[PDB]
């Protein structure tokens, strides 16, 4: 019974960093937050699209328009070179100001 969430700008970062490729689709966060907590998906749909909100609030992510129909849709939130190391900094951390 443990569903400890993280920062809204971390649930995207902490994911792309643990992904073997440095690139994740929007669902990426939906497949990471759960990989950690037990459910955090079949009960609260307020955090689902919630991540898509931080995907833009931040801009070091490589949000490209079209692609190579690899995923099927033209959209993907990745991590640039001078971006990952940056967000992973505010992600590996947590939400607690002084």
Swiss-Prot record:
Question: What tissue specificity does the UniProt entry give?
Answer: Expressed in both lymphoid and non-lymphoid cells.
Residue ranges of the TM segments:
none
Q: Which ranges does the entry annotate as DNA-binding region?
A: 3-98
User: Which superkingdom does the taxonomy of this entry point to?
Assistant: Eukaryota
* Binding-site positions, Mg(2+): 55-56, 58, 61
What happens when you mutate residue 52 to A?
A: Abolishes DNA-binding
Q: Where in the cell is it found?
A: Nucleus; Cytoplasm
Mind telling me how this protein is modified after translation?
Hyperphosphorylated during mitosis by CDK1 and, to a lower extent, CDK2.
Where do the record's region annotations for DNA-binding lie?
Answer: 45-63, 73-77, 93-98
- Quaternary state and interactors: Component of SIN3A-, but not SIN3B-, containing multiprotein complexes. Interacts with DVL1, DVL2 (when phosphorylated) and DVL3; the interaction induces DVL2 nuclear translocation. Interacts with SUDS3. Interacts with BAP1 (when phosphorylated); leading to recruit the PR-DUB complex and repress FOXK2 target genes. Accessory component of the polycomb repressive deubiquitinase (PR-DUB) complex, at least composed of BAP1, one of ASXL1, ASXL2 or (probably) ASXL3 and one of MBD5 or MBD6. The PR-DUB core associates with a number of accessory proteins, including FOXK1, FOXK2, KDM1B, HCFC1 and OGT.
Question: What is recorded about the domains?
Answer: The C-terminal part of the DNA-binding domain may contribute to DNA recognition specificity.
This chain's function reads: Transcriptional regulator involved in different processes such as glucose metabolism, aerobic glycolysis and autophagy. Recognizes and binds the forkhead DNA sequence motif (5'-GTAAACA-3') and can both act as a transcription activator or repressor, depending on the context. Together with FOXK1, acts as a key regulator of metabolic reprogramming towards aerobic glycolysis, a process in which glucose is converted to lactate in the presence of oxygen.
Q: What protein am I looking at? A: Forkhead box protein K2
Provide the species name: Homo sapiens
Its lineage opens with: Eukaryota, Metazoa, Chordata, Craniata, Vertebrata
Gene expressing this chain: FOXK2
Describe which stretch of the whole protein the shown chain covers, with first residue, last residue and complete length. Answer: 256 to 353 of 660
């Amino acid at each position: 019974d443990s569903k400890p969430p993280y920062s809204y700008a971390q649930l995207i970062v902490q994911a792309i960093t643990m992904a073997p490729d440095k690139q994740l689709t929007l669902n990426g966060i939906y497949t990471h937050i759960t990989k950690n907590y037990p459910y955090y998906r079949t009960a609260d749909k307020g955090w689902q699209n919630s991540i898509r909100h931080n995907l833009s609030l931040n801009r070091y992510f490589i949000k490209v328009p079209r692609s190579q129909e690899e995923p099927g849709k033209g959209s993907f939130w990745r991590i640039d070179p001078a971006s990952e190391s940056k967000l992973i900094e505010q992600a590996f951390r947590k939400r607690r100001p002084r």
